[PDB]
């Protein structure tokens, strides 16, 4: 085939791979931030559900 075909194919492959590398580094940074802050959807370790708490009148007035 023509050389220009391989030229364009190389350009496309380079773009795809470079974008993949950018995304991988971005993912690593995002993961570190989320695991160090817990401010993202990832690494949300469970906590006690407030629904379990009962607010009905107890026996002793001072709870």
């Amino acid at each position: 085939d023509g050389p220009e075909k391989n030229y364009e194919k190389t350009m496309a492959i380079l773009q795809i791979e470079a974008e993949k590398a950018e995304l991988r580094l971005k993912e690593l940074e995002v993961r570190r931030l989320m695991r160090a802050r817990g401010d993202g959807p990832w690494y949300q370790y469970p906590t006690i559900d407030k629904a379990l708490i009962d607010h009905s009148p107890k026996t002793t007035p001072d709870n």
Binding site: P57, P61, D62, N63
Partner: protein, 50 residues
Amino acid sequence: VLKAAAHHYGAQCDKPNKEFMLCRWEEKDPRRCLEEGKLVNQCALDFFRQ
């Protein structure tokens, strides 16, 4: 003595007693319903005075 007159005491002194219970069950602090406790004692004394 209290138990003998317990039923009548509750009936006669219902309002002051219930108010104090509501206070302690909402304020949840003995230092905010002290005056209500006084009224309960005073009304209880009046009940026995009669």
